[PDB]
Design a protein around this ligand. Sequence first.
Ligand SMILES: Nc1nc2c(ncn2[C@@H]2O[C@H](COP(=O)(O)OP(=O)(O)O)[C@@H](O)[C@H]2O)c(=O)[nH]1
Ligand SMILES: [Cl-]
Ligand SMILES: [Cl-]
Lengths: 280, 363
Amino acid sequence: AEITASLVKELRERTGAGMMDCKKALTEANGDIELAIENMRKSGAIKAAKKAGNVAADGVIKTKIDGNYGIILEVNCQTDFVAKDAGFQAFADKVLDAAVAGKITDVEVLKAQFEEERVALVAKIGENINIRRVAALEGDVLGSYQHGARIGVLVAAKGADEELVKHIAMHVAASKPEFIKPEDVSAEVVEKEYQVQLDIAMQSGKPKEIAEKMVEGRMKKFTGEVSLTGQPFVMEPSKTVGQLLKEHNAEVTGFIRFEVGEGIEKVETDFAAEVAAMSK
Amino acid sequence: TKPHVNVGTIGHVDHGKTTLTAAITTVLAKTYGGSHVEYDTPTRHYAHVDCPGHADYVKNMITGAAQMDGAILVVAATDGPMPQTREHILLGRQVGVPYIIVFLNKCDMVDDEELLELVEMEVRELLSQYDFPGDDTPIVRGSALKALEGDAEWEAKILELAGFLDSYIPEPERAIDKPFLLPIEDVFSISGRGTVVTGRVERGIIKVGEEVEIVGIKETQKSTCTGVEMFRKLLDEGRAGENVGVLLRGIKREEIERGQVLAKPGTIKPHTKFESEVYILSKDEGGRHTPFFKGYRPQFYFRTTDVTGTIELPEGVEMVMPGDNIKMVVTLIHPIAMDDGLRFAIREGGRTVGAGVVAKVLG
Ligand SMILES: Nc1nc2c(ncn2[C@@H]2O[C@H](COP(=O)(O)OP(=O)(O)O)[C@@H](O)[C@H]2O)c(=O)[nH]1
Ligand SMILES: [Cl-]
Ligand SMILES: [Cl-]
């Protein structure tokens, strides 16, 4: 078949592929749209490979609950413009649904299942896209909280209604505890931190007997501030979350907080400097 | 003292926004002589930023970066628009960019004119879908790179783009050409002269004999200017940017107060309820250490004074963390002179913890 502007348009309306990529694919395919699409599939893997070394520190956290089982998920891209795109969103929602339905906690299993769809999306969007991590939380009662696209939280609880779980998930989003209770902090970690603080206290000129007593106080502050129940409740900080839970005869058995780009150093850019370089 | 125009580039990473901007500076310097870039046409001075992130652009717009008078949408003709191109245009629509010019890049890589046409028509359609005038939009066909390398044919298209910056973006309005407005900082009476208000003329010109309205906080009043003075020296007029004392006929000391504005009659109104875009400082920027919630009841600092207001968070939003930027609807406890684009600080206990811009006046 002849390669007309109309036919190219149809392959483009159909794939979102670049205009020239479409003309080239369609031409090599003698106008067979389905074959063009297949050609663009093999090309797309190479377009995606080109992008795969790009830092992707933007994107979304998503969460989904199915009864006693919840999934939290990070899917990265390079800019928040793509993080808001409907195609990127639908991809991340599709990955999320499959992780829940299949109870998939091994991100490599998830990656493998969606790699071709990832590549087709990257070939359209022109940004590196990565299924970065996935985790499950299991619980009697589960709730979630999304702080926009950037922070997601799952909370597992017992004896807590929907509103209380939600407020606790919001508290975790804001205050990022890494333990549930201060007693959960291991004796080993506490003793290491004790030594840190005693070292700092001593070199500041505090006599040893005084520094020791001060540091024992710092240890209670320390386990309190890294633990959920020891933290002041963000919606009423005159009480800890532990007091809140007692008031409701509830407890928390788990939580996970993901934040987009955690542990990724984001690429510093100076537009003005970069423009100057090119011209000179 | 040529006009100042703020522009910016928006487009897909890799479509050539940095290269285009370098080509603009290079060719304009070559032709007319000599974080942001600057360049000049015979009649206009340009300040040019890039728009790499949605939230970053909205935040910079709120925290002081002057708004774009026009944007250059850069789309490589090889691809045509990306799926996220509607998110680029949607940002433009969100922040009220009043004009968008399109530079079709990489046309040195495309021979089929009918394909360039298809790309052009897709862009016009996208623009129109978000109420930019797609049919009337200037679209330049160029090569950022080949122009940067000094190719004559392609240099022309850079000059064509600069031509549209000149002709399609209206000369922005100078402060002094705008209707008179003065934010009132202090008020006193002079025995034999009468009431004097002081402040910095924000826009326009006030002359002896002209009527003014006193607007905000309390019911609007009208008066006549019987004198303008600077450093105890009498002037015939006060101009935008000057610190002055404006003498007023009839009106008394206790009938005017700080936070009101003097204005040309009929040109600014008092309002209590408005939509805004807001940015809450992070802890490191000296802001709050903790989030706030629906009952947060801060002060909104307009020009010279705090006004308490209550807030309505957008649907699905129940918490605002330091460093967040969000839309909010604000209802002040009494009216203040305002229009779209007015900037304000958000304060608590007299300390600035945020910034906003009025996006739409409601009531
Ligand atoms: N062929 C061609 N390449 C271009 C053109 N403009 C930029 N490029 C190349 O496209 C790549 C990305 O351009 P760049 O300005 O860095 O894109 P940005 O991320 O939008 O700022 C670089 O290799 C540029 O040299 C052009 O008009 N034609
Ligand atoms: Cl531990
Ligand atoms: Cl609050």
